[PDB]
């Protein structure tokens, strides 16, 4: 029942199975293929910088330009095969870490099993539609022939800013510039993540005050939570809010989508007003009702697939009732349990389950940033324990990197090296 | 049912559970304590050089003795706390590797559960005897109190030769310089291993396709398992040093110098079993059977203990360990069919079979030539060596390319001379 994490080296030959060249979403017209690695079922990693739709000059901002930024920039990151391989091995280690405890095993099982519905707002209701970029992509086999493949998630390396992680869904555009967003409308879609495990920020908490570096596996799990919402089609960008009561730990800047607070979880859930929590709930319910209605009409497909097997799959995914005549509908109690299951995956709960220390809430201040040079070194960071090996688990000493930023900078200047973090320029 | 592998750093404080000070066997008179780390139930690691009974000049041999030897010497290995901690982390990684597959999980469960019999040839038959160095040792707790503790195995770092791993049992001497070796007589005893995971040798093999020879570095987890098989024999009291033999035909892959105990061939397993003569195989079987019959007889007499232990619980434990029959009157005896299965089980653990189960390449047999030796600088780096796969990560598993380090010593030496660095192995001086 727990998923299998596959291993590979960057230079391993294509094998038409776990290592293939693929045409990722939005590369349809340019027809560009990338070497990709199937880390687990339905999840592909492309260990290169994300560059699509991005002005290339942003990868190497000038010195005057750089200082203002919280972030960090280096155009040469992931420019060599050696480093792409290093990136891959780290990603393998973080997936093994997530898969080392039941709470993370369940999350990966969801990422694998919550496949997008074969259709959206602008496709035929009677048809399981497989042939557009929200549900499948072209792959180039070893013999050079092109075939189509379905998947749930594609992970890239970072864009210009090495400290920025982000998740997004895919748009279907049939003609006349129309745009369907099935990842926001209950159907779900293939999701995209830009992830950068070796560049991290730290947070502050009072025991005494001290800085703690973030565990990359928890950072990854945070992105996988956004992914999960996209796959279940509950993903949002709007519903933006600021807190009613500003606590001292908070750094409030602009209104922020309610999704960030639901994603952090714990006490941040209450920052989202009841009125919005009910809106979101009722929107998802209306969308699942629509999907049930449409599922009753499906009698053909755009591919050679087993229609009845996919119908069983969507019955389980959306927890639909199936009556004595084979008609699907939404059962309100099963829906309530499903909505709860989807929003049970949170940074707060996962940090607790993994015995990882994390920030006080989404609006907590980020410090740094830091480069983490030795995630692959088991004397520093393990699959089973992260940084908190042995007695370093006590008060999360394994994540403790110093009192504050200035104190850290002096030490690095004096030549005191840490093998855990390096403060970035 | 699979065991738990613990983690610790060398500098973690004593905690009366996984980290305590222990007074190891033979250190009783000097009363010397060492910081020790319980990697799994009943197994302690002392990540220091093994020095007991060893002439200190041997740690730093002169150019004359050193040049001839196939080994490698460095008096400074494990002299610092940082390097002791590194040694601990590698050992943690190797135990996690062993515990990653069923065949190795079963081995570690045996190491945990085959506790020594509480008695030996020179202790009273009516008594469970706990108070000597073959079954218990002093440990010093966080508050400084000294108590007695039982365990099965203590692992140290290497002695003088950093490439030599070795296993041994403990001797009891009640009086008059007498010596009991319960680990050879069916009882078992606390076992000792000197283990050095970072220094390794390679072996040769000819590919069936290329018809070309190549050297393969040994996986330290398989090297540790080989020593654990010797421990297992000692815990079951079947350990031998004699019964030494040479092969019938010296095959081209072999390098033979002296007779070798039959136990090395049984430990390797596979075709090496057939090197041990049938008459010796029957002698060993009948010796163990005779020793276990004596233990069944002695267990029927036990009515007291030298410590506050639960007597009936330990009787149940030895009933299971030795697979004794128990009749309706509570009388223990040897059942011949259960004995045959136990003996088979003990000797089921072999380097050959574990290598197959782990998809690790190993040498053609115990007498195979060793090459090198090599330093392995990056066992802790998961891009070089992993718990789940060892060196053979991803497509490196095909033809065990992950262990393939080159054509021969000559080519390797030349490449290293040219400045071509490997992150897998370094040829030693
Ligand atoms: Ca590891
Ligand atoms: Zn977020
Ligand atoms: Zn041996």
Task: Could you tell me the CATH topology label of chain A.
Answer: Zincin-like
Quick one: CATH class of chain A? Alpha Beta
Q: How would you describe the shape of chain A?
A: globular
Report the CATH architecture of chain A: Alpha-Beta Complex
First-last Cα distance of chain A? 45 Å
Q: Would you count the extended β strands of chain A for me?
A: 19
Sheet of most strands of chain A = 8 strands, mixed
Tell me the quaternary state: homodimer
Beta fraction of chain A? 15-25%
Protein described:
It is classed as toxin. Keywords: toxin, Metalloendopeptidase, Proteolysis. The assembly is dimeric. The structure is a homodimer. With 425 residues, chain A is α+β, with helices and mostly antiparallel strands. Chain A has a single domain (1-425), classed as Zincin-like (Alpha-Beta Complex). Chain A has helices spanning 63-67, 81-98, 102-113, 216-231, 258-264, 274-295, 307-317, 332-342, 347-353, 405-414; strands at 19-22, 34-40, 43-49, 127-128, 136-140, 146-150, 153-157, 166-168, 191-194, 199-206, 209-213, 240-241, 256-257, 300-301, 321-322, 328-329, 367-371, 400-402, 422-423. Chain A has an eight-stranded mixed sheet with strand order 6-5-1-2-3-7-9-8, covered by helices on one side. A five-stranded antiparallel sheet of chain A has the order 18-11-10-17-19, with helices on one face. The first copy, chain A, has a two-stranded parallel sheet with strand order 4-14. Chains A and B meet through helix 2 of A and helix 2 of B. One zinc ion (ZN) binds at residues 226, 230, 264, 267 of chain B.
